[PDB]
Design a protein around this ligand. Structure first.
Ligand code: MNR
Length: 152
């Protein structure tokens, strides 16, 4: 797991996200979609987005980004004690949305990139280590539920 020190770093970094949840959410999803266009195909509500301009101009994409990061922030504030929060997400993503664990890897990487991009020189080596661990824990606990369901 993460240490107390590490959790404190994670939630300190998260303060940056909470100051502009929509901006961060948008950039995360744009980073995902542009870097991995197959991921866009998982969203019937975003498949019409043919260009990054169109993505950037989509109010609904920003709305979804807020939903995404709000759910993730809920999970993070539980400091690993997130069974109740993570289980239904694991299950809707495997059973309904059909999201391979690789895509969760993609978005984890996207969050790290976006933090650097929006906060260059203000997301230190310790911060990245702690946030990376938190995102890995999240991914790994989802992966456990995916295996349970035989998904992917
Ligand atoms: C590649 C695509 C996918 C990735 C990566 C991904 C990653 C993540 C992620 C990682 C940080 C979090 C947190 C996250 C959280 C959510 N997510 Mn998700 N998600 N996610 C979808 C695709 C993906 N998610 C789709 C498709 C829907 C339904 C969208 C709609 O039509 O309204 C959805 C829906 C949702 C919803 C709405 C409730 C539900 O349906 O369970 C939340 C919350």
């Amino acid at each position: 797991g993460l240490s107390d020190g590490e959790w404190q770093q994670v939630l300190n970094v998260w303060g940056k996200v909470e100051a502009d949840i929509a901006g961060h959410g948008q950039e995360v999803l744009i980073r995902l979609f542009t870097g991995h266009p197959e991921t866009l195909e998982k969203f019937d509500k975003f498949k019409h987005l043919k260009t990054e301009a169109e993505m950037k101009a989509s109010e609904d994409l920003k709305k979804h980004g807020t939903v995404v990061l709000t759910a993730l922030g809920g999970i993070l504030k539980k400091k690993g004690h997130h069974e109740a929060e993570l289980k239904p997400l694991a299950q809707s993503h495997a059973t309904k949305h059909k999201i391979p664990i690789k895509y969760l890897e993609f978005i984890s990487d996207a969050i790290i990139h976006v933090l650097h991009s929006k906060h260059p020189g203000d997301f230190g080596a310790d911060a990245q280590g702690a946030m990376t661990k938190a995102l890995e824990l999240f991914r790994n606990d989802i992966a456990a539920k995916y295996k349970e369901l035989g998904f992917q």
